[PDB]
RNA sequence: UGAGGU
């Protein structure tokens, strides 16, 4: 089975590369005054094959310093600083290749280049520069509202000992990624918001954790606060009006406007600023949504062949073989391997998935589950001020038959109006006796205004003081006739999974697998991490893949990753698994999450010596040793795989299959994985990088259990993109930082609470 | 917050 590898070939020449440092006697940092004037200088002096990095120059030549004075509207320095060859500092390599995309038309927003129209170079022929805006459009979103820039996402990689016929020095990654920017600036929205919010507490919540971009320097920040009390007529130490003046020569129209602060303190001018992606007032939008994916999610073949008539461009192959790297137009040549076909069973048919097929909703709706727990004492609530008596019944009514259908045997519940949907809990919570707190296993909740305060308020609520289980719908999301069957089947398998069992205390499972290729003995191991007070997520899974007993912990600081006492939570969870069953697990993999940049290989291998250290220090444990298998899964990748029928047509890889990364050159085995199936667009497959490995099997057994795990997410009927464990996890960690729960009642920690 | 891929 053929495949393409978005990779390309890319022969570097040891071009001599010299480094020089330019210095303006006047005090002026305006970003386009100094670029101008380095310009006019670089014009007199009359090197025209040069290249502009911020502070420094490149230079192919080196050529003593000249420094002149400028007569514009003033002294220009130049200062050689550095020269090595260009083939072995990769990092000199991207930032060649990143000033030659700034020149041919692209903007570095972040660490990517978008096209645009102005900050263009006129050596470029008008065929290149019209292929390139068909290639890249500057799309329009809600008729003049949004702009949606589409550019690439580049790197450049070394090769290890590739094949080929000669082993190439580097290959080049390519991806094409599309960015949206609001053309409202932010002072308007936050004007806006004044008008009819009329709260400063209000504006911040619904403001603070949003993302903007600032144009007159183009860098992107996080909204962290807004100071209404300071104004830019104030001064800081390095008025604002006067920064702004001399440093960008922007003229400020609004002297009253706040100021928004992001610390490492720094304070930004709404003005001046544009929100990043959707608005939250039309984030969930239906039609802006369709509008949006559409505009960005390019078919194979139409990724394929934009891909194909950008390295082919002739000029531009031209422009970047001028600076010694000299791109390949063809892809690399590659066999994959297909896994195993899979099949699901439940507790009424087996029904293998073979080609495609890769969603069972009809199985699901046409058939049974596999472990329910009795739903007895269950509280449904909904409010009374948007009151709908006989309606509240027969949602009652349909959710019994489809429990009932589903297999989950379910009694009346106590159908409950409440005005301020919050208090009642409340109430609830103040009389154990009368409410009979420990006799409720779940209580589903209606609520009509899809706030996140009163959202996050019930289910920390829920959590914290009772341990009754709760599920949430919208009731606008109800009340529509199209979907409301289909949203009320959802609600019976999530609630399946969410409410504790009598008998062992765990979640209800929906599905198996007839032949798991986890072996025996194994208990599966998925962590990860949300940075906000930072939480780390791990579940647990003695079975093969079946039911998770989550757990959760606080990083020992914010923005870094490393579990300080990962071996203590796991080596109790084996300790319990003993005392359960006088068992000793055979094998114990490890799907954390997370990306190998150099820093989280250190950081797991930290926490492979703490788990080490602690299963030594245990005294049941010592003796024998649990096999350990460290396994990174990676979510964020700019790799795609193309794929070739005999007919030499564009199509997505066909789902389960895998490659190992024989090219880019990293110390531990890396694998490519697409697990699942989009009916429009290439795929983006899932990076499985074996770090550390213990256990007998060969890391190919392991690829294989990470698609399983894929092909078992309870959470969506069909196949999905990363492996259960991993998303599990990842939930976990969303649940309890964006919810702010203090600690979850130990009774549903082995519930799936997360879905 | 019906939910995953985009
Ligand atoms: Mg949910």
Redesign the pocket.
């Given at each position: 089975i053929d495949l393409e590898m978005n990779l390309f070939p890319v022969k570097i020449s040891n071009l001599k590369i010299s480094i020089y440092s330019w210095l303006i006697f006047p005090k002026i940092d305006n970003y386009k005054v100094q670029r101008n004037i380095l310009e006019i200088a670089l014009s007199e002096e009359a090197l025209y094959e040069y290249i502009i990095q911020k502070n420094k120059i490149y230079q192919k030549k080196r050529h003593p310093n000249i420094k002149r004075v400028v007569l514009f509207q003033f002294q220009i320095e130049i200062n050689h600083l550095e020269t090595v060859y260009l083939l072995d500092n990769p990092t000199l390599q991207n930032e060649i290749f990143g000033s030659i995309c700034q020149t041919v038309g692209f903007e570095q927003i972040g660490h990517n280049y978008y096209y645009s129209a102005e900050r263009q170079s006129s050596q470029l022929t008008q065929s290149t520069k019209e292929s390139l805006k068909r290639i890249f459009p500057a799309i329009e979103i809600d008729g003049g509202k949004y702009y949606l820039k589409q550019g690439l996402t580049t790197a450049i990689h070394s090769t290890k000992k590739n094949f080929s016929k000669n082993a190439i020095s580097n290959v080049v990654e390519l991806e094409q990624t599309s960015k949206l920017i609001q053309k409202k600036n932010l002072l308007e929205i936050i004007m806006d918001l004044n008008r009819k919010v009329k709260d400063h507490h209000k504006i911040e919540n619904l403001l603070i954790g949003s993302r903007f971009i600032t144009h007159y320097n183009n860098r992107i920040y996080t909204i962290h606060g807004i100071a209404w009390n300071k104004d830019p007529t104030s001064t800081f130490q390095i008025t604002f009006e006067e920064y702004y003046k001399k440093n960008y020569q922007l003229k400020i129209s609004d002297l009253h406007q706040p100021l928004i602060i992001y610390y490492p303190i720094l304070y930004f001018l709404p003005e001046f600023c544009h929100l990043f992606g959707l608005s939250n007032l039309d984030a969930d939008n239906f039609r802006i949504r369709q509008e949006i994916?559409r505009n960005?999610?390019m078919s194979p073949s139409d990724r394929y062949r934009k891909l194909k008539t950008f390295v082919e461009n002739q000029d531009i192959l031209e422009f970047f073989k001028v600076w010694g790297l000299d791109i390949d137009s063809r892809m690399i040549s590659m066999s994959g391997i297909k896994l195993p076909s899979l099949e699901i069973q439940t507790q009424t048919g087996v029904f293998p998935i073979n080609f495609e097929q890769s969603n069972w909703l009809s199985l699901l709706n046409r058939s049974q589950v596999i472990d329910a727990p009795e739903l007895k004492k269950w509280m449904i609530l909904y409010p009374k001020k948007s009151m709908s008596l006989q309606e509240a019944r027969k949602f009652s009514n349909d959710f019994q038959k489809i429990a009932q259908q589903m297999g989950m045997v379910c009694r009346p519940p106590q159908l409950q109006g409440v005005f301020d949907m919050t208090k009642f809990l409340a109430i609830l919570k103040k009389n154990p006796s009368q409410h009979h707190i420990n006799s409720i296993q779940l209580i589903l909740t209606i609520?009509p205004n899809?706030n996140?305060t009163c959202?996050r308020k019930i289910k920390q609520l829920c959590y914290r003081d009772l341990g009754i289980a709760?599920?949430?719908?919208?009731l606008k999301?109800?009340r529509d006739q199209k979907?409301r069957m289909?949203?009320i089947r959802?609600?019976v398998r999530?609630i399946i999974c969410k409410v504790p069992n009598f008998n062992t205390k765990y979640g209800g499972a929906l599905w198996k697998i007839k032949n798991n290729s986890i072996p025996d003995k194994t208990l599966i191991v998925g962590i990860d991490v949300w940075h906000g007070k930072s939480i780390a997520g791990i579940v647990f899974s003695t079975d093969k893949g079946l039911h998770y007993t989550a757990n959760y912990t606080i990083t020992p600081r914010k923005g870094l990753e490393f579990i300080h006492n990962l071996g203590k939570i796991i080596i109790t969870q084996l300790q319990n698994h003993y005392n359960a069953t006088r068992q000793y697990f055979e094998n114990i993999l490890i799907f954390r999450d997370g990306v190998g940049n150099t820093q989280y290989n250190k950081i797991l291998q930290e926490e492979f010596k703490s788990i080490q250290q602690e299963l030594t220090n245990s005294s049941i444990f010592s003796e024998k040793h649990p096999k350990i298998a460290i396994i990174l899964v990676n979510k964020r990748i700019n790799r795609r795989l193309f794929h070739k029928n005999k007919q030499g047509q564009i199509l997505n890889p066909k789902p389960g299959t895998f490659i190992e990364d024989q090219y880019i050159k990293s110390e531990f085995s890396n694998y490519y994985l697409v697990p699942?199936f989009?009916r429009?667009?290439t795929?983006?497959p899932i990076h499985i990088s074996v770090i550390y490995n213990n256990t007998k099997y060969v890391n190919f057994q392991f690829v294989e259990i990470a698609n399983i795990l894929c092909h078992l997410?309870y959470?969506?009927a069909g196949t999905?993109?990363?492996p259960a464990s991993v998303?599990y996890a990842h939930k976990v960690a969303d649940f309890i930082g964006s919810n702010q729960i203090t600690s979850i009642a130990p009774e549903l920690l082995q519930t799936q609470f997360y879905?």
């Amino acid at each position: 089975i053929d495949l393409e590898m978005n990779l390309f070939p890319v022969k570097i020449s040891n071009l001599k590369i010299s480094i020089y440092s330019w210095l303006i006697f006047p005090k002026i940092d305006n970003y386009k005054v100094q670029r101008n004037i380095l310009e006019i200088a670089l014009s007199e002096e009359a090197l025209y094959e040069y290249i502009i990095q911020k502070n420094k120059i490149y230079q192919k030549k080196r050529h003593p310093n000249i420094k002149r004075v400028v007569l514009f509207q003033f002294q220009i320095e130049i200062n050689h600083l550095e020269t090595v060859y260009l083939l072995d500092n990769p990092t000199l390599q991207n930032e060649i290749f990143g000033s030659i995309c700034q020149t041919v038309g692209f903007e570095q927003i972040g660490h990517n280049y978008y096209y645009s129209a102005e900050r263009q170079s006129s050596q470029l022929t008008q065929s290149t520069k019209e292929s390139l805006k068909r290639i890249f459009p500057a799309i329009e979103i809600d008729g003049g509202k949004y702009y949606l820039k589409q550019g690439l996402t580049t790197a450049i990689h070394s090769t290890k000992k590739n094949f080929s016929k000669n082993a190439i020095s580097n290959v080049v990654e390519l991806e094409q990624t599309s960015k949206l920017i609001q053309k409202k600036n932010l002072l308007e929205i936050i004007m806006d918001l004044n008008r009819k919010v009329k709260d400063h507490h209000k504006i911040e919540n619904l403001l603070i954790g949003s993302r903007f971009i600032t144009h007159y320097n183009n860098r992107i920040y996080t909204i962290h606060g807004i100071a209404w009390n300071k104004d830019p007529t104030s001064t800081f130490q390095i008025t604002f009006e006067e920064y702004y003046k001399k440093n960008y020569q922007l003229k400020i129209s609004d002297l009253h406007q706040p100021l928004i602060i992001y610390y490492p303190i720094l304070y930004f001018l709404p003005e001046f600023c544009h929100l990043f992606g959707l608005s939250n007032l039309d984030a969930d939008n239906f039609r802006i949504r369709q509008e949006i994916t559409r505009n960005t999610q390019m078919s194979p073949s139409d990724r394929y062949r934009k891909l194909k008539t950008f390295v082919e461009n002739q000029d531009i192959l031209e422009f970047f073989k001028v600076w010694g790297l000299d791109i390949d137009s063809r892809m690399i040549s590659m066999s994959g391997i297909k896994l195993p076909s899979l099949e699901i069973q439940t507790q009424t048919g087996v029904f293998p998935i073979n080609f495609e097929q890769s969603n069972w909703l009809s199985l699901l709706n046409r058939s049974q589950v596999i472990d329910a727990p009795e739903l007895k004492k269950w509280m449904i609530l909904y409010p009374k001020k948007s009151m709908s008596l006989q309606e509240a019944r027969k949602f009652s009514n349909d959710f019994q038959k489809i429990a009932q259908q589903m297999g989950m045997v379910c009694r009346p519940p106590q159908l409950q109006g409440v005005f301020d949907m919050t208090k009642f809990l409340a109430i609830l919570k103040k009389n154990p006796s009368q409410h009979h707190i420990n006799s409720i296993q779940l209580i589903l909740t209606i609520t009509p205004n899809r706030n996140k305060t009163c959202y996050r308020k019930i289910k920390q609520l829920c959590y914290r003081d009772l341990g009754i289980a709760n599920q949430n719908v919208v009731l606008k999301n109800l009340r529509d006739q199209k979907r409301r069957m289909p949203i009320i089947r959802n609600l019976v398998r999530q609630i399946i999974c969410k409410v504790p069992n009598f008998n062992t205390k765990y979640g209800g499972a929906l599905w198996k697998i007839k032949n798991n290729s986890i072996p025996d003995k194994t208990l599966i191991v998925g962590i990860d991490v949300w940075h906000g007070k930072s939480i780390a997520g791990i579940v647990f899974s003695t079975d093969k893949g079946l039911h998770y007993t989550a757990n959760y912990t606080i990083t020992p600081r914010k923005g870094l990753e490393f579990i300080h006492n990962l071996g203590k939570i796991i080596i109790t969870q084996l300790q319990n698994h003993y005392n359960a069953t006088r068992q000793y697990f055979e094998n114990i993999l490890i799907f954390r999450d997370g990306v190998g940049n150099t820093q989280y290989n250190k950081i797991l291998q930290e926490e492979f010596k703490s788990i080490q250290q602690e299963l030594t220090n245990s005294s049941i444990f010592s003796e024998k040793h649990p096999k350990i298998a460290i396994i990174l899964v990676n979510k964020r990748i700019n790799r795609r795989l193309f794929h070739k029928n005999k007919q030499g047509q564009i199509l997505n890889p066909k789902p389960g299959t895998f490659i190992e990364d024989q090219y880019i050159k990293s110390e531990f085995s890396n694998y490519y994985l697409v697990p699942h199936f989009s009916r429009f667009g290439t795929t983006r497959p899932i990076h499985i990088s074996v770090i550390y490995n213990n256990t007998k099997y060969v890391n190919f057994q392991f690829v294989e259990i990470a698609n399983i795990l894929c092909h078992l997410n309870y959470n969506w009927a069909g196949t999905v993109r990363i492996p259960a464990s991993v998303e599990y996890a990842h939930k976990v960690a969303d649940f309890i930082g964006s919810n702010q729960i203090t600690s979850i009642a130990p009774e549903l920690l082995q519930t799936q609470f997360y879905l």
